[PDB]
């Protein structure tokens, strides 16, 4: 009884990804510690910068949607990639018919 | 006699034993020494902001990256049309071999 | 069953296209608020810095 | 002729598979 000795796909059992990185919050121990100084009574006439970016946030949910728009177009890229792969399998099937008639 | 042990043609080697311990977090160094009596009034106003035209270049690179993610789905639609015309080509080759 | 495995390779190649688009879509969403709003919110902030 | 009725149904399914490939890669190819 002649048999080819079984080897195996053991390169899948060798799965080292030794990654660990900086999981620490507040780099340098930082938080907004209380400053409180000498009680300077300056009047300040308070010429405002108004801040129309008091969480312009609709824009940063929209930065996530300028990228959900990229996710849907790229889901359609992968679905149309795998649609051309299905029509390549339809080519392999007609290339097999083309070997019968040959 | 074949030169083949069974399965020896492919062992998919997920051995990519990379360690990136690198500290991507740099301390954005704040200082606030104790702010004395600023009763000196000579602090002129300036309110100069924001450009940031690199953020509108990045918004244009997000439009361009989406337009690549669309031109790739369109090239792969036209590539499935090319492989439908290869389906028709192997159908037409098998019909020539029939004739 | 090579005809049925060809539909199941259409599904596993449509997974590969769904991931191709969606790893671009996660990257466009995790960026577009850093691009377009990433200039408008920078003028929005420079006029607060200009207000003080 | 009765086999050709079934072959012309497969040829209409190929003419339809064209429109499905045309429709699916168009879902992948995408706007501003």
């Amino acid at each position: 009884v002649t048999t080819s000795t079984r080897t195996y796909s053991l390169g899948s059992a060798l799965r080292p990804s030794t990654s660990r990185s900086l999981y620490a919050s507040s780099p340098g121990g930082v938080y907004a510690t209380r400053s409180s100084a000498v009680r300077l009574r300056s009047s300040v006439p308070g010429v405002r910068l108004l801040q129309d970016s008091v969480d312009f946030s609709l824009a940063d949910a929209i930065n996530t949607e300028f990228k959900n728009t990229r996710t849907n177009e790229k889901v359609e890229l992968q679905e149309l990639n795998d649609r051309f792969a299905n029509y390549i399998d339809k080519v392999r099937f007609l290339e097999q018919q083309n070997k019968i008639l040959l | 006699t074949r030169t083949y042990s069974l399965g020896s043609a492919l062992r998919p080697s997920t051995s990519r034993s990379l360690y990136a311990s690198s500290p991507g977090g740099v301390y954005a160094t704040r200082s606030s020494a104790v702010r004395l009596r600023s009763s000196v009034p000579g602090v002129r106003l300036l309110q100069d902001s924001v450009d940031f035209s690199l953020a509108d270049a990045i918004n244009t690179e997000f439009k361009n990256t989406r337009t690549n993610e669309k031109v790739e789905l369109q090239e792969l639609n036209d590539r499935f049309a090319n492989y439908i015309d290869k389906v028709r080509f192997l159908e037409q080759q098998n019909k020539i071999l029939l004739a | 069953v090579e005809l049925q495995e060809l539909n199941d390779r259409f599904a596993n190649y449509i997974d590969k296209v769904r991931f191709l688009e969606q790893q671009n879509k996660i990257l466009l969403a995790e960026l577009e608020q850093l691009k377009g709003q990433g200039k408008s919110r920078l003028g929005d902030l420079y006029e607060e810095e200009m207000r003080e | 002729q009765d086999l050709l009725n079934v072959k012309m149904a497969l040829d209409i399914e190929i003419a339809t598979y064209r429109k499905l490939l045309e429709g699916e890669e168009s879902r992948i190819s995408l706007p501003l």
Binding site: - | - | - | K7, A9, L10, D11, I12
Partner: peptide
């Protein structure tokens, strides 16, 4: 019979 097996399936939504 080969020339009939040459041809089509689809499935449906």
């Amino acid at each position: 019979a080969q020339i009939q097996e040459q041809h089509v399936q689809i499935d449906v939504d």
